[PDB]
Amino acid sequence: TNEIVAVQLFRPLQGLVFDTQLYGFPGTFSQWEQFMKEKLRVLKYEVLRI
Amino acid sequence: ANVWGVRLADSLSSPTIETRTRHYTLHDFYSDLDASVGKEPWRPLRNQRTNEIVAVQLFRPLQGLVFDTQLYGFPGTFSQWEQFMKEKLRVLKYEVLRIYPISTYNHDRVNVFVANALVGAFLSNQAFYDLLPLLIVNDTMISDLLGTGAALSQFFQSHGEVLEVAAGRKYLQMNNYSNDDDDPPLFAKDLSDYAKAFYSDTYEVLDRFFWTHDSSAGVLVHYDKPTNGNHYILGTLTQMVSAPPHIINATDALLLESCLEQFAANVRARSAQPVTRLDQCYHLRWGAQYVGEDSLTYRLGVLSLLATNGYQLARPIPKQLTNRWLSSFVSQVVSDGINETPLWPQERYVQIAYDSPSVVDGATQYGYVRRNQLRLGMRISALQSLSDTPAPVQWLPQYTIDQVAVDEGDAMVSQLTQLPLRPDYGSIWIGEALSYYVDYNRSHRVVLSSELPQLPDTYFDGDEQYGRSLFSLARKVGDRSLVKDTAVLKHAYQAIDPNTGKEYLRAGQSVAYFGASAGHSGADQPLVIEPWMQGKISGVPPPSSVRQFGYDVAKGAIVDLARPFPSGDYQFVYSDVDQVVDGHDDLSISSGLVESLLDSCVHATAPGGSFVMKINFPTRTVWHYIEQKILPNVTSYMLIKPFVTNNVEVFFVAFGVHQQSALTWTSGVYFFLVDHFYRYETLSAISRQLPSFGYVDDGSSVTGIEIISIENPGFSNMTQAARVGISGLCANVGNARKSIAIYESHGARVLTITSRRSPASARRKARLRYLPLIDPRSLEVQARTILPSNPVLFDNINGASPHVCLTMMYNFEVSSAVYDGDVVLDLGTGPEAKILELIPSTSPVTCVDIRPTAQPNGCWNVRTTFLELDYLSDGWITGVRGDIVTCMLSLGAAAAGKSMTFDAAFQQLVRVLTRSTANVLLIQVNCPTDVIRTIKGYLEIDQTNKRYKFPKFGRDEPYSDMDSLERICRAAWPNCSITWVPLSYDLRWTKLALLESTTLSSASVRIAELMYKYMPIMRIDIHG
Amino acid sequence: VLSSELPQLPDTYFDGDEQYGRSLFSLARKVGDRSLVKDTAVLKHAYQAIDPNTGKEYLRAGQSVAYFGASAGHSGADQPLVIEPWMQGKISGVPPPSSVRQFGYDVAKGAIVDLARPFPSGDYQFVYSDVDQVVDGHDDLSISSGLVESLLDSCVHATAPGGSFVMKINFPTRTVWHYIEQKILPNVTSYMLIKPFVTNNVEVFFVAFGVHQQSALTWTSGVYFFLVDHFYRYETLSAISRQLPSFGYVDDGSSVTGIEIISIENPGFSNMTQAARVGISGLCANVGNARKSIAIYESHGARVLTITSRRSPASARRKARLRYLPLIDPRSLEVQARTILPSNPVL
Amino acid sequence: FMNIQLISPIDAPILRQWAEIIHRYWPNPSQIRYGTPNVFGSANLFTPPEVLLLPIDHQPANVTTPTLDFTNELTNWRARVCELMKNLVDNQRYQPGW
Ligand SMILES: C[S@@+](CC[C@H](N)C(=O)[O-])C[C@H]1O[C@@H](n2cnc3c(N)ncnc32)[C@H](O)[C@@H]1O
Ligand SMILES: C[S@@+](CC[C@H](N)C(=O)[O-])C[C@H]1O[C@@H](n2cnc3c(N)ncnc32)[C@H](O)[C@@H]1O
Ligand SMILES: C[S@@+](CC[C@H](N)C(=O)[O-])C[C@H]1O[C@@H](n2cnc3c(N)ncnc32)[C@H](O)[C@@H]1O
């Protein structure tokens, strides 16, 4: 079908040990990656402030 | 530079002309109260990434919106909002015109407080009728509000010669405002109450009023040209939240907004356009006992004083402000760092320095003091921001007189590299396959089969397989088999027979194909079959029918081609079968399989025809077998070589099978085989020194890429360490192309420098003694934003030009001629001396060109001498000591510059070289060696006037023949040993072009060789 | 003529009023691209030169030129806007060159160097340079003149002899004239110095032809006349520009030139009173036969007319001519019963 | 709570907007200026004399016959609290049994 059904992760986000309900990601890939970009930008501002 | 974020040093500016104020009359109030389509009292603010209206800035008639947003109830969309405002202000217009006749109240000034409060009360439905008698003013603007008796405490109240009034709502928030990172900041001026401005007439009465009044949040003055009279502004304790990492309060936001607005106004001053106000800075007046040092209110008071004096920010600010930019600016200002400027914030008065360009003292009677004590050393000019580029641009260095040690620069560049990264590789060799051919002649020579060379024994080793696999992985093509087949057919259909006179191969041929493969990302056949059948090659005639055999057919049959099989007899047969698959990795079985393929391809040839055989591993047994068996039964032959991938495989083409004759091998074939094997040896020796395909770089490789990335805050003279590091990188690079990029990375302005190293660069690093230092001015001037790209190893994607390839050929000739430990001298290097990367490290040099150089004086291990005295002239070479003189690509240029003939220029050169002490010498001369083909588009000769006419460079040079050159050489020295070095068919010169990381060509290296044959280099030994 | 006889900048050049006049003229003068118009002018006047040695001309097609002082941002391509039309031959007074390389502090498709002291490059048969003495010069004539001398040295040594170069000079002073007369003119076959006039300043262009041949050239009386005409032109136009108001001013009446309006009302058909006639006639005496435009429109429930015109120092002279203020015939305004919609006033 | 960015609107919109209501609509302090220090000089310390501090805003009235209207920060606060609680109860995923 050429549909995105899974995501392989890499070095900075590999500590996702908790349950999926604790995170609550959206199901679609585009909304998922937009959510990840926004929230990692928030984390970027926090770590650069530290 | 800096206080805590960098401000722009070395210049300061301020506006000069201030507009004279204008009293606000009732006709102006009516014209603002109705909303024309040309101008209206609200300007929309818009989002940056979506271009959506999210906020509204308000102006003079509607500025009294002090109540809560629920009390008004505006619609959220901007168009419905402005339509509602136009309708309701038209109702208010009809009411105020019904109260006041325009014809008798045309030219009297109206009251600003009553106007703003009237609009705000009418929009909120809060009993506005008791304001209408106060609308027309008398005896001053402020005393009517003082001595009035109408009780309305929602807007103003009097304390006795001091009126307080609740200002509010400079900006207005829409529904779609969502605190996004590209939303414009509103500076807490959209709330119900952010400040309480207290108006009066005299600052002494204001200061007496603030004895019993608190000053908790701190008050703010204006002192330049206030809005409606002399007043203080006390902000309340509300917060601003539309700035994420930190929350500031009200008076902090007011001082921040006015400081940024004055920083905007200091840049755009052009000394002829007027501004409405000389400075908008506040200069806090009483709260400094409560806000102390290292706090944000104190630091913005410092920046407010600097903005009043007229400083500029080191980085440019946007036209429309964003929350990310505001967050970054305040995050820069709350940091560590001392106040480097002498300007300290006072308390009694706002001070300005002695040579500050502001003229605010002349237009203001009270507030400013020209302090003669402290001075500012920086000069007066405006800002000049250069325009940014998206791509990285080239940089060239210029050197200075100072010098340090080499290991210090090596330690500094080891501190500054980001070198463990994975660069993109690129491509070594681009273009169509080069074609090397030889054919049988009756009259050359008969040689024995044992004399012909074979494979080297160190062929299947790990380093050799590494080199061949590296070259095959990096060389970029379309279809290998297609290019090979086009080459072999175009060189096969040129043959003519000695029996008849036409040729061997014709149209309607009924050919056979051996070794067919299916997968080629196209049709399920080799990609030469259907264009060769349709005649699209246009150097061939089309055959009649093509049948294809081999292990991997799709439209043929699978057989074993070693021993025979049921088929017809084909008039021509082409074979592509290799000895790798069936041969079990040994030369004996490989040679026997070659013999079996030759037997099958001879017996399947339908006599009176031709065949083409490929040979992967040409060994002595193969040569002996083909000389014993095939050549007596073949009329004529040729063996050719398409060169696409570095290997020793050749093609064998035989014509006229099954006729009794006597053919052997020739000395031309011997020369071809020696050239072929030495070409393989040289290119394999080159390919075994490159790094791998997808490597990461650690610095230990002799060639590769290296970068550094050091930061530069604003305009600043860079320190010693940055200069040492960049100069050490320049000494490590050795005049290759160097590209820079300046960009903000994670809240820091940083620049990178990207270039490459070479073994010639390592030789130049071995040449010198002390590390010289560059002039950093060309990097200090740069204020752009040069966006970077990912680094590549082979940058040149279009390939090398034939002038560059010819230059590398002459450079290889010089580097091969010059021995170790020998004095040399060069004629015409240029501003940079390329010969420093050619001569060995122990050999001293003394070069000369008519143009002054750029290579540094001093700091070398061995003697280097630079001088500029027009070497063609006389009277200088007596003191000059050298053993061999080199003139490359400059004798014709000097002959064209002097507008004299090439023979007379060469005669003047040899007359001035007779006085020297050299014995061997080689120079480049302009001489036709072969018959002239007058190369189209690169070298078009003049036969009459004898000029060259290079079209790419726009230059032309005289020439003469080797007869005249040898005549003048023998007239100069009777015992001179003249010789002419040949060109390199074996590509031995490609070392300097590949080890210095340059993708060469195919067509341009063909053109470079055919250009080199028309202007060679001669070598003269005056003894022997 | 000797180099000491040629004029120079006036000493009152960097003052506040002079910078005010130059900035007013530069802000009010409307163009497309300054550099494009200057380059078209200098190339059309550069390719007219003929040599005394041969008979054709100096500059031809296939020239392999160099460009100094490149800037990136021009609201178009990231290069000066003369390069690709001059390469495609769209100017049609020029032949196209062979290749254009661009140097300077602000390149985008070239390399950044310091043009004062030399640098590794080739030898170009023609070279056009704009490097100016404002950025690197620290606002003084001595360092500016020395930087002019250094740019002349670099541009002479980078000229590939038998060619030509074009140099711009912002601040032509006596030291600059003396240096160029001592050094450049014996090594140059022929020259010309031209002036494209777009913005009021004293900057000129220097174009030299035939570098690195020994000859004897000096300055001429025609060049002296040209320099006197140039400097007096600057002086007159600066004296004009220092009397105008600013760019975005509001008008108060004290300016010697500007705009003034009145707006008195007229209810229906009525013979207007004495006061309206006196006011309109006083405006006519203040205007002094310039063009006068009116507009009649209902404003906030009142029929009112406006009269818009401008004043001048010639108008002030005419106001100083007369003794008693004469009065107009108001009939041409009393007949008008139209609705003439107004527009915003312009200067 | 001090940094509003760290509350994501996708996970906690109710908590984010309640935090915004607290940060923006909480009542402001003011003063009333009691007393006289002519006789019995004021015993205020860490504040200036002749001033009191009040945690809510104070405008003074203009009439002596008081009636009811709806314009002060306390009724605004009650309105915003009721507005967020109706935004909370209108959602069905937070109380599915209702
Ligand atoms: C000759 S190349 C392919 C060249 C390709 N047809 C072209 O010209 O583009 C490799 C092919 O040779 C075939 N081959 C190798 N040894 C063979 C043998 N002894 N008999 C028949 N086919 C052989 C293999 O089946 C393989 O498909
Ligand atoms: C094109 S270059 C050749 C040198 C270098 N290989 C190159 O390709 O740039 C021409 C050089 O010849 C030198 N030259 C020409 N005529 C000369 C003369 N009469 N005396 C000394 N040098 C001269 C110039 O200085 C110039 O650097
Ligand atoms: C020559 S003017 C303006 C030229 C104009 N932008 C043009 O495109 O013709 C100033 C420019 O010259 C460049 N420049 C390069 N080298 C320079 C030098 N040594 N001194 C002054 N300016 C230099 C600066 O980057 C600056 O943008």
Say if residue B560 carries a ligand binding annotation.
yes
Phi/psi for B617 (5° steps) reads -125, 85
3-state secondary structure B590-614: HHHHHHHHHHHHHHCCCCCCEEEEE
- Which helix (H) or strand (E) segment is B788 a member of? none
- In ligand 1, the atom with minimum distance to the C-alpha of B560 is 20
Interface contact A46-D6, CB threshold 8 A:
yes
Q: B70 contacts in D (CB within 8 Å)?
A: 76, 79
Spatial distance between the Cα atoms of B698 and B677, rounded to a whole number of angstroms: 34
Give the count of alpha carbons within 13 A of C51, CB side only: 18
Q: How far is the CA of B588 from the centre of ligand 1 (A)?
A: 20
Is B520 annotated to bind a ligand? Reply is yes
Residue at token pair 């002479």: C156
Tell me whether chains B and A touch (3+ CB pairs under 8 A): yes
A25: contact with D, CB 8 A cutoff: no
Which residue, among B615, B622, B627, has the nearest Cα to B446 in the 3D structure?
A: B627
Rounded to the nearest 10 degrees, the angle between the axes of helix C313-321 and helix C274-287 is 120
Chain C residue numbers touching B107 (CB-CB < 8 A):
none
Q: To one decimal place, what's the resolution in Å?
A: 3.6
Q: How far is A38 from chain B (nearest CA, A)?
A: 10
Q: Name the B residues in 228-257 with CB < 8 Å from any D CB.
A: 236-239, 241, 244-247
Q: From CA B912, how far away is CA B894, in angstroms rounded?
A: 14
Sheet holding C303-311, edge to edge: C258-265, C303-311, C293-298
Q: Are B959 and B651 within 8 A, CB to CB?
A: no
Residues of B in contact with D28 (CB under 8 A): 193, 236-238
Mutate to test the interface with A, among D2, D7, D8 (most CBs of A within 10 A): D8
Decide: D31 and D54 in contact? Cβ < 8 Å: yes
- Measured N-to-C along each axis, helices B902-913 and B962-972 cross at an angle, to the nearest 10 degrees, of 30
**What residues does ligand 3 touch, defined as CB less than 6 Å away?**
C 35, 69-71, 80, 104-106, 114-116, 130-132, 135-136
Distance from CA of B164 to the nearest CA of C (A): 31
CB C194 within 8 Å of CB C207:
yes
Determine contact: A24 vs chain D, CB below 8 A.
yes
* Nearest ligand atom owner, CA of B888: 2
Cβ pair C159, C124 in contact under 8 A: yes
CB-based contacts of D12, cutoff 8 Å, min separation 6: none
Q: Tokens for B352?
A: 């300005």
Nearest beta carbon to residue A24 from set D5, D6, D11: D11
Test A39 with D5 for CB contact under 8 angstroms: no
* Dist. CA B848 → ligand 2 center (Å): 8
Q: Which of C79, C129, C86, C85 has its CA nearest to residue C109?
A: C79
The whole-angstrom distance between A14's CA and the closest CA on chain B is: 22
Residue B832 beta carbon below 6 angstroms from any ligand 1 atom: no
Residues C326, C277 contacting (CB under 8 angstroms): no
The arrangement of strands across the sheet holding B53-58 comes to B42-46, B53-58, B171-173
> If DSSP codes are grouped into helix, strand and coil, which group holds residue B403?
strand
Give the number of other Cβ atoms within 10 Å of residue B920's Cβ.
Answer: 17
DSSP 3-state of B509: coil
Pairing type for strands C100-102 and C65-68 reads parallel
- Residues belonging to the binding site of C are 35, 67, 71, 74, 105, 114-116, 123, 130, 132, 136
Distance CA C181, CA C171 (A): 16
Q: Is B888 annotated as a binding residue?
A: yes
B463 is in an annotated binding site: no
Question: Using CA atoms, how far apart are residues B228 and B357, in angstroms rounded to an integer?
Answer: 27
Task: State the closest ligand 3 atom to the C-alpha of C113, by its place in the atom list counted from 1.
Answer: 16
**Contact partners, residue B827, CB within 8 Å, separation at least 6:** B847, B848, B849, B871, B885, B886, B887, B888, B890, B891, B923
The answer to whether B336 contacts chain A (CB < 8 Å) is no
Strands (E), B169-253: 171-173, 195-199, 219-220, 231-235, 239-240, 248-249
DSSP reduced 3-state for B445: coil
How far apart CA C234 and CA C238 sit, in angstroms, is: 6
Cα–chain-centroid distance for residue B91?
A: 62
SS3 B971: helix
Query: For residues C298 and C267, is the Cβ–Cβ distance under 8 A?
Result: no
List CB contacts of B6: < 8 A, sequence separation 6 or more: B314, B315, B713, B714, B716
Find out whether B805 and B879 touch, Cβ atoms under 8 Å.
Answer: no
Task: Report the alpha-carbon distance of residue C191 to residue C206 in Å, rounded.
Answer: 8
Token digits for C265?
A: 């009302």
**How many Å separate Cα B956 from the centre of its chain?**
34
Which of D62, D72, D73, D78 best tests the B interface by mutation, with the highest count of B CBs <10 A?
Answer: D62
Residues 106-135 on B with a CB inside 8 Å of D are 126
Question: β-pairing, B572-575 with B511-514?
Answer: parallel
Query: Does the beta carbon of B526 lie inside 6 Å of ligand 1?
Result: yes
Looking at the CA of B486, name the nearest ligand.
1
Binding-site members of C for S-adenosyl-L-methionine are: 35, 67, 71, 74, 105, 114-116, 123, 130, 132, 136
Verify whether ligand 1 is closer than 6 Å to residue B577 (CB atom): yes
Burial of B804 (0-12, 13-18, 19+ CB in 10 A): middle
Question: Which residues on adjacent β-strands are paired with residue B25?
Answer: B109
Give the separation between CA B296 and CA B292, rounded to whole angstroms.
9
| Residue among A42, A46, A48 whose CB faces B747 most closely | A48
Q: Hey, are the CB atoms on B396 and C122 less than 8 Å from each other?
A: no
**Ligand 1, pocket-test mutation among B567, B576, B589, B598, most atoms within 8 A of CB:** B576
Record the tokens describing residue B392, joined without a space.
């990285």
D15 to chain B, closest Cα gap in Å? 15
B-chain CB neighbours of A46 within 8 Å are 245
Give the C-alpha separation, B251 to B235, whole Å. Answer: 5
Among the partner-chain residues C16, C118, C265, the one whose CB lies closest to the CB of B103 is C265
- Measured in angstroms, the CA of B245 and the nearest CA of chain D are apart by 6
Contact between A35 and D5 using a beta-carbon 8 Å cutoff: no
Please state how this structure was obtained. cryo-EM
Helix (H) or strand (E) holding B970, with range, is helix B962-972
Say which ligand is closest to the CA of B594: 1
- B245 CB neighbours in chain A (<8 A) are 45-46, 49
A10 contact partners, CB below 8 Å, separation of at least 6: none
What is the C-alpha to C-alpha distance for residues A23 and B636, in angstroms, rounded to an integer?
80
B 228-257 residues with CB below 8 A of A? 244-245
For D25, other C-beta atoms within 10 Å of its C-beta total 17
Q: Which two tokens stand for residue B962?
A: 């080797």
Identify which of B636, B569, B568, B625 has the alpha carbon closest to the alpha carbon of residue B598.
Answer: B625
Interface membership of A50 toward B (CB under 8 Å): no
Chains C and D touch (3+ CB pairs under 8 A): no
How many CB atoms neighbour CB B298 within 10 A?
Answer: 14
Burial of B551 (0-12, 13-18, 19+ CB in 10 A): middle
* Nearest alpha-carbon partner for B758 in B793, B714, B726: B793
What is the distance between the alpha carbons of residues D38 and B753, in angstroms, rounded to a whole number?
Answer: 75
Query: Counting Cβ atoms within 10 Å, is residue B707 exposed (0-12), middle (13-18) or buried (19+)?
Result: buried
CB-CB: which of C24, C119, C136 is closest to B854? C119
Q: B549 C-alpha to center of ligand 1: Å?
A: 9
Q: What is the Cα–Cα distance from B617 to B630, expressed in whole angstroms? A: 18
D50 Cα to chain B: minimum distance (Å): 6
User: What burial class does residue B544 get, using C-beta atoms within 10 Å of its C-beta: 0-12 exposed, 13-18 middle, 19+ buried?
Assistant: exposed
Test A48 with B746 for CB contact under 8 angstroms.
Answer: yes
Contact B396 C19 (CB under 8 A): no
Identity at B116, one-letter amino acid code: N
Tell me how far the alpha carbon of residue C115 lies from the centroid of ligand 3, in angstroms. 9
